[PDB]
PDB file of C-alpha atoms in Angstrom:
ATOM      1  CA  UNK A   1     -36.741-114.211   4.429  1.00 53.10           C
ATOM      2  CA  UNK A   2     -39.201-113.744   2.090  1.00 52.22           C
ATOM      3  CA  UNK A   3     -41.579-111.099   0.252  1.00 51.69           C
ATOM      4  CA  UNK A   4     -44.615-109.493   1.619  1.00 52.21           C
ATOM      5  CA  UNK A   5     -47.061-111.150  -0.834  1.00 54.35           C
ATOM      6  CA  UNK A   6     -45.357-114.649  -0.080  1.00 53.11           C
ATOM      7  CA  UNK A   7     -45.255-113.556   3.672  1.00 49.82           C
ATOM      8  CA  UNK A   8     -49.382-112.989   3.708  1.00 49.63           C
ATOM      9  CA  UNK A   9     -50.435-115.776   1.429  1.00 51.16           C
ATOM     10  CA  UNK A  10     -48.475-118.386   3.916  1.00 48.62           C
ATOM     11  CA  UNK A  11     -50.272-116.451   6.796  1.00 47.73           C
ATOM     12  CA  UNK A  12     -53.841-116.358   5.530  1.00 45.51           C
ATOM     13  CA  UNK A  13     -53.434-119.877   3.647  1.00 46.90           C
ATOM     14  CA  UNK A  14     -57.050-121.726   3.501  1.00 49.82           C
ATOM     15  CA  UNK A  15     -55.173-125.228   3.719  1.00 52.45           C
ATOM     16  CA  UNK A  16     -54.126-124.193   7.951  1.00 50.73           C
ATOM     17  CA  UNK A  17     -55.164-126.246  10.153  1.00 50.74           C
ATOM     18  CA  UNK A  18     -54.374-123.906  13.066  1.00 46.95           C
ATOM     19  CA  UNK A  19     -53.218-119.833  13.073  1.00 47.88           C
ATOM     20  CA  UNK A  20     -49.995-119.291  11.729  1.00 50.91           C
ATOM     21  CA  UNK A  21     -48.689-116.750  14.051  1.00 50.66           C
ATOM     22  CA  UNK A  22     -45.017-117.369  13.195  1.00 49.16           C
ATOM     23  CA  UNK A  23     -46.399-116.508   9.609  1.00 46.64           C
ATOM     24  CA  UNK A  24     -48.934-113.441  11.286  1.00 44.88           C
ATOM     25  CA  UNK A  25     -45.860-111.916  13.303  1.00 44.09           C
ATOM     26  CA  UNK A  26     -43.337-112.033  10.484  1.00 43.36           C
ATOM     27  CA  UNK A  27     -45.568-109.826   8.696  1.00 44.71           C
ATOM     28  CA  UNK A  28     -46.032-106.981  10.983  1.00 41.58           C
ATOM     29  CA  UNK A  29     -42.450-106.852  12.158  1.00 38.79           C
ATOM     30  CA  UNK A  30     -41.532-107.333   8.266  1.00 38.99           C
ATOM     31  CA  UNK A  31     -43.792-104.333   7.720  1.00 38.76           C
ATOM     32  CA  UNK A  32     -42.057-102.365  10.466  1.00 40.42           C
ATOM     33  CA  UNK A  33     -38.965-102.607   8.930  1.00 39.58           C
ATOM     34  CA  UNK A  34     -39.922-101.651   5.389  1.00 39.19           C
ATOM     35  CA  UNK A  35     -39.746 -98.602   4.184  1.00 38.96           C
ATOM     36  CA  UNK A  36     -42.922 -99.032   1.561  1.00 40.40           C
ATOM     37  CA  UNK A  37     -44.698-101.425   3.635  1.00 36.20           C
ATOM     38  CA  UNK A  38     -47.940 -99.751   5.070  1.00 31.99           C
ATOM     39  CA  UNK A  39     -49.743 -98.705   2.039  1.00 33.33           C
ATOM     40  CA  UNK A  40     -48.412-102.226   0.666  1.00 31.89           C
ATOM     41  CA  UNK A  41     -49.786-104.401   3.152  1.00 33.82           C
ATOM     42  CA  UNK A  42     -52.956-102.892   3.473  1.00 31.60           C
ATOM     43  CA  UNK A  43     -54.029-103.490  -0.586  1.00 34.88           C
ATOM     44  CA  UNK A  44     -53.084-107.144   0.260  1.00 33.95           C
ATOM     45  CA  UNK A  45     -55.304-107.029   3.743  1.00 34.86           C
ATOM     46  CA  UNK A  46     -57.843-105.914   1.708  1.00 34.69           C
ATOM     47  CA  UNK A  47     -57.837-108.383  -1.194  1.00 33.64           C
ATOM     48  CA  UNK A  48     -57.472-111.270   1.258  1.00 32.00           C
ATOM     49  CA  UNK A  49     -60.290-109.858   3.522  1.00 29.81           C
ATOM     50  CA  UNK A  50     -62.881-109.800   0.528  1.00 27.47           C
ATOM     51  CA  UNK A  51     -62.405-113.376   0.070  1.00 31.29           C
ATOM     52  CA  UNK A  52     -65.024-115.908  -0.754  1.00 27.61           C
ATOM     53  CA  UNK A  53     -63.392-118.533   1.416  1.00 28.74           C
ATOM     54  CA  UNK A  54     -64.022-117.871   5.162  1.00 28.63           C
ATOM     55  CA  UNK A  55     -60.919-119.318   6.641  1.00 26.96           C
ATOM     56  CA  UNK A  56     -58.873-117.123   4.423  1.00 26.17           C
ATOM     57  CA  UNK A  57     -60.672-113.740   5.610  1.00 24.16           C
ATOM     58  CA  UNK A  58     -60.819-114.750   8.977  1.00 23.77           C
ATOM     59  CA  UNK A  59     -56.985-115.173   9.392  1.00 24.69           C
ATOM     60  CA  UNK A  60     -56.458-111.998   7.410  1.00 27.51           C
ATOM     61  CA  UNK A  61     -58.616-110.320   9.696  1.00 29.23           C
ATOM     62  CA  UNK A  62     -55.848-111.960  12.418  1.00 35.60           C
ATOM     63  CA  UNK A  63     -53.176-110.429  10.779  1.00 35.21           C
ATOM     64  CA  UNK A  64     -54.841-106.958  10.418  1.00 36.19           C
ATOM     65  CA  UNK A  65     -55.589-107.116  14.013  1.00 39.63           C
ATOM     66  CA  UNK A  66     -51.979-108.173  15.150  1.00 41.01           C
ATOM     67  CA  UNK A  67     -50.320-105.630  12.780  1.00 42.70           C
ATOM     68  CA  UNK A  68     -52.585-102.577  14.149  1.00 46.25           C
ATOM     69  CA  UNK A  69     -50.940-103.295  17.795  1.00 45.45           C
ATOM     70  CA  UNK A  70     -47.691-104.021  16.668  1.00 47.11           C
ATOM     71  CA  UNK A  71     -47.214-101.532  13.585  1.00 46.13           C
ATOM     72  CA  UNK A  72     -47.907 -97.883  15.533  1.00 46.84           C
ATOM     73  CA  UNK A  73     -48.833 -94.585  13.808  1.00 45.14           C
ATOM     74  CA  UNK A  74     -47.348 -95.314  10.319  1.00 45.63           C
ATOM     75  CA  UNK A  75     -49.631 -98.199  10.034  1.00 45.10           C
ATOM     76  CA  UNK A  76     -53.008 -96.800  12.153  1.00 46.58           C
ATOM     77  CA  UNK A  77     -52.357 -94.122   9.561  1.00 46.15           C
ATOM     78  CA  UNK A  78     -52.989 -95.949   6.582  1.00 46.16           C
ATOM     79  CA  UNK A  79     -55.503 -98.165   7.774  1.00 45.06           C
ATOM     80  CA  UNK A  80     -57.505 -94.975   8.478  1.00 45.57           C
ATOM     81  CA  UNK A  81     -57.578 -94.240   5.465  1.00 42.76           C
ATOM     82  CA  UNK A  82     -61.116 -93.829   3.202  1.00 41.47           C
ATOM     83  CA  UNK A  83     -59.530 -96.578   0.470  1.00 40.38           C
ATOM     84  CA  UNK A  84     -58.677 -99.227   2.714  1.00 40.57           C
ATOM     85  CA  UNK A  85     -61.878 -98.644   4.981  1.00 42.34           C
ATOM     86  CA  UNK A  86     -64.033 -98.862   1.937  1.00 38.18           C
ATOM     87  CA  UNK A  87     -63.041-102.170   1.299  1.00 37.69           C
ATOM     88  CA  UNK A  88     -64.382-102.888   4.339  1.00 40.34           C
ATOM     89  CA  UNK A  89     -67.113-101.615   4.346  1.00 37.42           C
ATOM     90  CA  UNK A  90     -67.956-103.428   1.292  1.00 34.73           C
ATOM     91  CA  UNK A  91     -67.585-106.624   3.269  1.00 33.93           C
ATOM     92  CA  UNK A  92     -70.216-106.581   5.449  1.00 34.09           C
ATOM     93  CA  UNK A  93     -72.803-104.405   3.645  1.00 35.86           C
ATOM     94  CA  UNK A  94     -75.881-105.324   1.359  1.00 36.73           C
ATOM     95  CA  UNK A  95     -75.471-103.092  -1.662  1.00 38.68           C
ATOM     96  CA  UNK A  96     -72.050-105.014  -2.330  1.00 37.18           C
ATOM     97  CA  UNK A  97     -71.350-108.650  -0.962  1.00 40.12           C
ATOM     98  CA  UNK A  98     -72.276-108.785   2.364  1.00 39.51           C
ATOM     99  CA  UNK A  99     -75.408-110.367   2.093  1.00 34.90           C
ATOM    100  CA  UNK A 100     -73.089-113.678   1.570  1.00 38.04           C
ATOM    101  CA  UNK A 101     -70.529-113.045   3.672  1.00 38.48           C
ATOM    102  CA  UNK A 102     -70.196-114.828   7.224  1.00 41.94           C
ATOM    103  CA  UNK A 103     -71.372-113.821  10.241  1.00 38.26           C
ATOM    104  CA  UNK A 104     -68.471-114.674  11.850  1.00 39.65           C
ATOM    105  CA  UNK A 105     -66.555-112.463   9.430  1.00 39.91           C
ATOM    106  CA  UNK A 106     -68.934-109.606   9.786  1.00 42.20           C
ATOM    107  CA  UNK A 107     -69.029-110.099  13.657  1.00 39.91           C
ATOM    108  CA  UNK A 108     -64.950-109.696  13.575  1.00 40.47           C
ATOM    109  CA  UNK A 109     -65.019-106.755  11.043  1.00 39.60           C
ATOM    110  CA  UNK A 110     -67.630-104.634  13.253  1.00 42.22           C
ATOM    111  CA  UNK A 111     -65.187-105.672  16.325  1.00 39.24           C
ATOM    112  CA  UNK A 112     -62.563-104.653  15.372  1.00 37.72           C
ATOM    113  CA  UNK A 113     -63.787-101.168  13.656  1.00 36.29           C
ATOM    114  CA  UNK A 114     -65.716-100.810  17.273  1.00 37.72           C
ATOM    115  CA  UNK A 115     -62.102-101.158  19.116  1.00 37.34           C
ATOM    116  CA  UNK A 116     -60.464 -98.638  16.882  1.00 36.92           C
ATOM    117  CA  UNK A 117     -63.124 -95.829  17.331  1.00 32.57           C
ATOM    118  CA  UNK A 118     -62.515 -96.207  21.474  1.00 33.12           C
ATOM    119  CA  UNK A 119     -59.338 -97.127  21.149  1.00 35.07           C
ATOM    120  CA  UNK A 120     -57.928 -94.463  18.667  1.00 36.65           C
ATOM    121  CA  UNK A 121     -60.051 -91.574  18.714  1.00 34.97           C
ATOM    122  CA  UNK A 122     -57.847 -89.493  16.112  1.00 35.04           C
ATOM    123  CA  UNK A 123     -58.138 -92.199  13.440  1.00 30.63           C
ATOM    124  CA  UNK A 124     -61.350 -89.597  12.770  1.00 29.61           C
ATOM    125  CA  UNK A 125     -62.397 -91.820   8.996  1.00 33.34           C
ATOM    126  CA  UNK A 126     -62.741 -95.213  11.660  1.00 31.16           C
ATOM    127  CA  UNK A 127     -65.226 -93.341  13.557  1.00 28.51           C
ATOM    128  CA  UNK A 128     -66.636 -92.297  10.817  1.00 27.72           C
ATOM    129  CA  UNK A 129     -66.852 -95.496   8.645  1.00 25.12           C
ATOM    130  CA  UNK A 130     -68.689 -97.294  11.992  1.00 23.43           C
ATOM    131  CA  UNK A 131     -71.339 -94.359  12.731  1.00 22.18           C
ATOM    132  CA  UNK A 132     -72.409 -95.004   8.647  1.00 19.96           C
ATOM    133  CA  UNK A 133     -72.947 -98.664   9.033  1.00 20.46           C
ATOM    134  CA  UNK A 134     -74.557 -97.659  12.939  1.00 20.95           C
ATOM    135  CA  UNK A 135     -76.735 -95.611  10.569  1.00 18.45           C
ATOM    136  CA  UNK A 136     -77.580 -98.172   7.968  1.00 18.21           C
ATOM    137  CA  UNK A 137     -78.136-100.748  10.599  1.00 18.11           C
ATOM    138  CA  UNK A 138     -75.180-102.627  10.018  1.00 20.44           C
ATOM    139  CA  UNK A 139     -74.407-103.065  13.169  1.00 21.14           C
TER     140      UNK A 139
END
């Protein structure tokens, strides 16, 4: 076994060739298992999201996905939450660094934040982190 930092920086390495998803799983059910690991994994997801490199962001935007299927409430909790989605939103909008930031990796982001707004309607901050960048014209 290893440590969730180790764990996440072997899934979202920019040297894959292909997805890691021995790497991608590991992490979820790690996280499901760990009594700290929500709030924990979700600073990482962020930093990793932010990054310059698009192969790096892209397969942390895997893991996120994966982890908000596998992890349940404890997890949709803290994702919901205004410090994680911020960091987010930062990705894909003009006042911070989305104006360099892939369209692929914008496409996914606005995906997936779409999804949770149908898909969970009592994560209330998702809905209301997509209807602001509806508003600004992000999406």
């Amino acid at each position: 076994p290893e440590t969730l930092e180790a764990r996440i920086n072997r899934a979202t390495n920019p040297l894959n060739k292909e997805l890691d998803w021995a790497s991608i799983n590991g992490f979820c059910e790690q996280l499901n298992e760990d009594f700290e690991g929500p709030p924990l994994a979700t600073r990482l997801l962020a930093h990793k999201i932010q990054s310059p490199q698009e192969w790096e962001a892209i397969q942390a935007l895997t893991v996120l996905e994966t982890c908000m299927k596998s992890c349940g409430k404890r997890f949709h909790d803290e994702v919901g939450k205004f410090r994680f989605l911020n960091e987010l939103i930062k990705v894909v909008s003009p006042k911070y660094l989305g104006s360099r930031t892939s369209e692929k990796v914008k496409n996914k982001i606005l995906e997936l934040l779409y999804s949770w707004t149908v898909g969970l309607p009592e994560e209330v901050k998702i809905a209301e982190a997509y209807q602001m960048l509806k508003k600004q014209g992000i999406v």
